Amino acid sequence: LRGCPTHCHCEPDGRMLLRVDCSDLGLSELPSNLSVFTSYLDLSMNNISQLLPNPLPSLRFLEELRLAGNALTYIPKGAFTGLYSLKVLMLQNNQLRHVPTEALQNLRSLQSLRLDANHISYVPPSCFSGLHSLRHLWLDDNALTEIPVQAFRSLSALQAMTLALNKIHHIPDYAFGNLSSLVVLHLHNNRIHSLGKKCFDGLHSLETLDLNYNNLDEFPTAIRTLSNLKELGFHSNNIRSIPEKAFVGNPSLITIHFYDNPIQFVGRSAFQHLPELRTLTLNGASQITEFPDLTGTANLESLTLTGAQISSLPQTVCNQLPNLQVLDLSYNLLEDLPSFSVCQKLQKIDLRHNEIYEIKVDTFQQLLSLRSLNLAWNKIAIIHPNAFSTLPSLIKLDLSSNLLSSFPITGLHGLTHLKLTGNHALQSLISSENFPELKVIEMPYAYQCCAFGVCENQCSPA
Amino acid sequence: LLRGCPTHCHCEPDGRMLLRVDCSDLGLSELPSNLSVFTSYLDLSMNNISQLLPNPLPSLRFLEELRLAGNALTYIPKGAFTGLYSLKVLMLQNNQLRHVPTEALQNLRSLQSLRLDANHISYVPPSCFSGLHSLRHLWLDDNALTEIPVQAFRSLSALQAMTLALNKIHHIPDYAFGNLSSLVVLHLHNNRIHSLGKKCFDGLHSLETLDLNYNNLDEFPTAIRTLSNLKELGFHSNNIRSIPEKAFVGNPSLITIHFYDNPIQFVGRSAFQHLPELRTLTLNGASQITEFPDLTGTANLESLTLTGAQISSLPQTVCNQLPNLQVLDLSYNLLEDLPSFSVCQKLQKIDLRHNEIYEIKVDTFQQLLSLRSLNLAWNKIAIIHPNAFSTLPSLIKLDLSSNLLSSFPITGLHGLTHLKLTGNHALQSLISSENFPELKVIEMPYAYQCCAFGVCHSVQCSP
Amino acid sequence: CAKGCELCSEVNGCLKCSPKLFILLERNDIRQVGVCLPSCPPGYFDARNPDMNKCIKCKIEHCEACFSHNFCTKCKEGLYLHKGRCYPACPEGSSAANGTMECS
Amino acid sequence: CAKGCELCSEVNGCLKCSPKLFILLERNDIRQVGVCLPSCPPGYFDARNPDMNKCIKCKIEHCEACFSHNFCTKCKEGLYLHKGRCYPACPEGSSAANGTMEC
Numbered sequence A: 001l002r003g004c005p006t007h008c009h010c011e012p013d014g015r016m017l018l019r020v021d022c023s024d025l026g027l028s029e030l031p032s033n034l035s036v037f038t039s040y041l042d043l044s045m046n047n048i049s050q051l052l053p054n055p056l057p058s059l060r061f062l063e064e065l066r067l068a069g070n071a072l073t074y075i076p077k078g079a080f081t082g083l084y085s086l087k088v089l090m091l092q093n094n095q096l097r098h099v100p101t102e103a104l105q106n107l108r109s110l111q112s113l114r115l116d117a118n119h120i121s122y123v124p125p126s127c128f129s130g131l132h133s134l135r136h137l138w139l140d141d142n143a144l145t146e147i148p149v150q151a152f153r154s155l156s157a158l159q160a161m162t163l164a165l166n167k168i169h170h171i172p173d174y175a176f177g178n179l180s181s182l183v184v185l186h187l188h189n190n191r192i193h194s195l196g197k198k199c200f201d202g203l204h205s206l207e208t209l210d211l212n213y214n215n216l217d218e219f220p221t222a223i224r225t226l227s228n229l230k231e232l233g234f235h236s237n238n239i240r241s242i243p244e245k246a247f248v249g250n251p252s253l254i255t256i257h258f259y260d261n262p263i264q265f266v267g268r269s270a271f272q273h274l275p276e277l278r279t280l281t282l283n284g285a286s287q288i289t290e291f292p293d294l295t296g297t298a299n300l301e302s303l304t305l306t307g308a309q310i311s312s313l314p315q316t317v318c319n320q321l322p323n324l325q326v327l328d329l330s331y332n333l334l335e336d337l338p339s340f341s342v343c344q345k346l347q348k349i350d351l352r353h354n355e356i357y358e359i360k361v362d363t364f365q366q367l368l369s370l371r372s373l374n375l376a377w378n379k380i381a382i383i384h385p386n387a388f389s390t391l392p393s394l395i396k397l398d399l400s401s402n403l404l405s406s407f408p409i410t411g412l413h414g415l416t417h418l419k420l421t422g423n424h425a426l427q428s429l430i431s432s433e434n435f436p437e438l439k440v441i442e443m444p445y446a447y448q449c450c451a452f453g454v455c456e457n458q459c460s461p462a
Numbered sequence B: 001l002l003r004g005c006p007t008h009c010h011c012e013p014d015g016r017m018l019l020r021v022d023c024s025d026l027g028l029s030e031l032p033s034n035l036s037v038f039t040s041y042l043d044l045s046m047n048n049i050s051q052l053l054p055n056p057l058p059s060l061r062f063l064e065e066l067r068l069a070g071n072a073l074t075y076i077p078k079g080a081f082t083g084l085y086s087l088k089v090l091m092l093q094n095n096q097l098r099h100v101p102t103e104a105l106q107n108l109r110s111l112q113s114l115r116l117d118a119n120h121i122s123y124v125p126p127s128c129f130s131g132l133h134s135l136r137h138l139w140l141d142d143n144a145l146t147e148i149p150v151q152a153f154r155s156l157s158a159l160q161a162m163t164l165a166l167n168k169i170h171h172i173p174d175y176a177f178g179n180l181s182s183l184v185v186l187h188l189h190n191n192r193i194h195s196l197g198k199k200c201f202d203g204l205h206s207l208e209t210l211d212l213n214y215n216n217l218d219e220f221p222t223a224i225r226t227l228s229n230l231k232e233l234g235f236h237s238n239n240i241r242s243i244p245e246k247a248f249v250g251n252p253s254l255i256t257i258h259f260y261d262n263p264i265q266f267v268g269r270s271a272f273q274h275l276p277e278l279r280t281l282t283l284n285g286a287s288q289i290t291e292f293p294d295l296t297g298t299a300n301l302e303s304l305t306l307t308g309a310q311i312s313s314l315p316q317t318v319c320n321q322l323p324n325l326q327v328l329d330l331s332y333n334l335l336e337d338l339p340s341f342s343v344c345q346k347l348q349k350i351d352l353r354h355n356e357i358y359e360i361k362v363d364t365f366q367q368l369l370s371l372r373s374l375n376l377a378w379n380k381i382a383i384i385h386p387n388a389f390s391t392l393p394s395l396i397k398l399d400l401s402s403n404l405l406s407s408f409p410i411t412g413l414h415g416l417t418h419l420k421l422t423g424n425h426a427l428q429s430l431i432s433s434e435n436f437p438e439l440k441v442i443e444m445p446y447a448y449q450c451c452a453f454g455v456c457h458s459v460q461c462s463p
Numbered sequence C: 001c002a003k004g005c006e007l008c009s010e011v012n013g014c015l016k017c018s019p020k021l022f023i024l025l026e027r028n029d030i031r032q033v034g035v036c037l038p039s040c041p042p043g044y045f046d047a048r049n050p051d052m053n054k055c056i057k058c059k060i061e062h063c064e065a066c067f068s069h070n071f072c073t074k075c076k077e078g079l080y081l082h083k084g085r086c087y088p089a090c091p092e093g094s095s096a097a098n099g100t101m102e103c104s
Numbered sequence D: 001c002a003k004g005c006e007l008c009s010e011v012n013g014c015l016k017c018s019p020k021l022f023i024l025l026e027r028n029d030i031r032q033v034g035v036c037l038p039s040c041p042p043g044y045f046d047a048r049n050p051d052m053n054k055c056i057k058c059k060i061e062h063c064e065a066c067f068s069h070n071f072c073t074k075c076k077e078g079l080y081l082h083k084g085r086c087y088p089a090c091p092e093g094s095s096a097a098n099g100t101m102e103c
Ligand SMILES: *[C@@H]1O[C@H](CO)[C@@H](O[C@@H]2O[C@H](CO)[C@@H](O[C@@H]3O[C@H](CO)[C@@H](O)[C@H](O)[C@@H]3O)[C@H](O)[C@H]2NC(C)=O)[C@H](O)[C@H]1NC(C)=O
Pocket: A153, A154, A155, A156, A178
């Protein structure tokens, strides 16, 4: 060890470059004797009030400076002048109350800067001036109030930024103008109440946007301009409706999160043209009266839409839904049902608590992959015998509380689950044979259960 | 000695020396001969008996019971049963009778029970039942009746039980069962009853059970009003749409009421008042119920479930109306604020899922010592006062799935069996194995929280 | 299959009865076994329905034969019969007992 | 209890971290053990939240360190880094590679 600050632990970076770990030494200030050739300096969790009695610039080889968990209150302007090789700077978990006014300027090689977990509330404009290499910026867990749009304009090389866990309440138009290269933007856990119609118009390269855990009152239409957007989150807000053609501006969207929003209405065309979208979930949108249009977005694999007032389905609804595997339209007002035959690859169906009165023949024909079918709590007065004739993979079936009187045994032999409770008019018996492999049975009458080996003196009717 | 027990038949001694003769499934062309009097029981059933008779056998003054079922009789001659002064029970089911014997059944003074079901009868001639003073029981199901034979029934003031089920009766005129004061049990199910008079049951004061099930009613049977001694009432599997205000005012001491498989949309609030003997009430999918129903003078409900409606809120003292209640299911409504529920002791299960509840205060579940299962899933519960669950010793199952929670009240609640918290995405903090022994089923918003319990008596946990 | 029975299983006996017959399910302990009768034995009562006619045991205290459930036809001797039910007493509405046990 | 840790359990170690620290869960032999760090080790990325600050593995193909999931900060050598992701190629939108590997 030569030049490796006494008490600290050093190491070779590239050959003859020096990496110095003086972390968790509880130093009052940093050591005076520090070898140039240092390419990595870690000073973390070290109660460091000020820099310095003797600060050490001229370490032109310094690649990475870590200054976290230190009690710094400010940064002098000439502090980092020597460092021509600085790529990453870490200044988190300090009591900084504003971005260093000039101290950070013209670090030409600086690539990633962490200023999270401080008490910063003010960002002086052109504090980031001349940072041509800056790609990654942290400003979370701070006390910001507005977007420092002015200061952010110079950072045209930024690729990722976090303004999360602040107190930002509003986003002005063009608030991130010059940031053409930005790819990942995180605004979650703020108090964002309102945002402009052109507030995201700058960043064309943006792929992911996090607006989650905020206080938004309406859908963010600025979204329109983000053509390369891939992942979008604005859940846990107070939004009430999704407008027609809401995501028209953003094909190649893959994941969308808008849960924990009291969404009541959704436009029918709102989810059109998203070919890479795989799953759609819409719970408790009471004000939806029609099935949504899904033109140019046929690659849905899981569609669930419940708690609405949907009266009926387009008869060629399945034409829009190949690749669909699970379909859950429970708790609506459905009476008649389309063919569903076109919707192969369907494995699961949940149509409970609808007002369905009849099950026709073709309404479940050629569903070879279908394994689970729930039609419980409908008002199904009659089922055509051959309705279930062509469902080889069917194993789970629930027809509970349907006002049935008889049953179609044809096909369906040896399914695993069968539920018939609440069909009080269903009184005739059913043999254990015609039905091996039943592991769960529900039946309106105890003796009908006994016919399967159960019935005490485990199902049951009762 | 054979005793003259009609060769092929099986006889035996009844009272002192009374004789019971079974000549049933013998496929007889007609009925025997000899067959000495002193017979107190005669069974001829499943016997290809075309006509009675070439030689009939009256003078059987001791005959207590005559069975003549499955014999394929097409008619009954007028003098057929003249000898039988002791006849209490006559069985004529599964024959091809097309109408009640016009006179043949008259003045069987001791006849107590008569079975005429499973025939093809469509006409009931008036005064075919004339002089049947002892008749208590009458079967007329599985026949082709079209209307109530009011005239013929008017004489039967001694009837206690009657079944006109599985016919095609479509309508009941007012006072259709006038004189039947002694009647207790009336069965009209599996008919095509579409409309019935408002005073169509005004006759029978002694009626205790009424079965109107499996019919084509469009409206509530308000005639019910006059049946004060009614105990059991069934009109399920119809097409009724509503229960009117004060629907069961006329029938306290009601115990069981069946109206399921009816598309009931509205229910009067006072409709279920004053039924102290009513034990269970279930109301599924009555969308137009907007207010909790009044249950004055009917406090002995043990299970109350009312779902699929628009109930906005509960009177703060609803539970005062609900002691002895054990199960409460008000799922799938529009509830925001909640009353004390403390008064509703003896409560074992509570289901309040798919409501719009935003907050759980302190007193809203205090002192529910018998409570075992509580479901608050799919609510919008943003906050829970810590001690809300402090006083729930018997609590074992808890479901808060798909809520707007960020944190959790561990206080009290220790050592329950089931815990479900998925869908609370703001719930990110961890949970210790201790503070929770005996947890055999767990659902958790994040997998890492599950791992804290040992997952990737045995216990489980899933994301 | 069985006497007047349309479909049976080797294990459980008769599953479906001929048109106007009644099915009686008997516990041979453990297995249930289905019999097909022209009418129901004492203890049971005949119940007609459009899909299945069934013999139904009469769980009425001290009843021998009955009209349906909830209504007794002939009560156990040593017990008075009043309106399909069986009491020691027998009210008070105004009954009393003749040379019989059928509280008027 | 532990270094900057407020509550621990006998089985799982630390349950809650001091104000601005990150929790790191180490899953060994089907059991979770909780550590409290000032920041997350390589492979993990720092995620700040108001209830729990947590270290999160970035299971991103051939990534060494990352900004979040879905975005890689420092990619493995022998693989070009393009818009937070790591490819052999790297388009065509208009990238190319100097003396570095950051297309
Ligand atoms: C907004 O973003 C644009 C583009 O991202 C920025 O334009 C860039 O500005 C810098 C200097 O401000 C240019 O650097 C060059 O420096 C050399 C010598 O130092 C000189 O010869 C060049 O003519 C140029 O000044 C860079 O080339 C230029 N790039 C483009 C595409 O315009 C702009 O500065 C940003 N403006 C604000 C207010 O943030």
